[PDB]
Amino acid sequence: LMKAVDKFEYRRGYKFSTYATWWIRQAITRSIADQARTIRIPVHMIETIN
DNA sequence: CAGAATCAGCCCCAATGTGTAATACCAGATTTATGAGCGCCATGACCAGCCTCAAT
């Protein structure tokens, strides 16, 4: 959310929630793919497994 | 003389401690595997006498 706030633009006329949701979900998924296993697995291989 | 205050004595409530036998894509950077190559310790082939025997 802080990262999304750092790059939000209000001139487009869209609400902040639509822009912030993408960043929040991307950060959450990246964290899950990074630090949720005892043995680290790369993001591309995690995506292939999914 | 009765009053209630601030201290020990007493009591109710909480707490811990015990309990046995064999998503998606995008771009930029990195690395392991096959490319050959220099270079060599050690395989197989000689090759000179000092070391080890014989007859007179």
TrEMBL record:
Sigma factors are initiation factors that promote the attachment of RNA polymerase to specific initiation sites and are then released. This sigma factor is the primary sigma factor during exponential growth. Belongs to the sigma-70 factor family. RpoD/SigA subfamily. This is RNA polymerase sigma factor RpoD. It is found in: Cytoplasm. Interacts transiently with the RNA polymerase catalytic core.
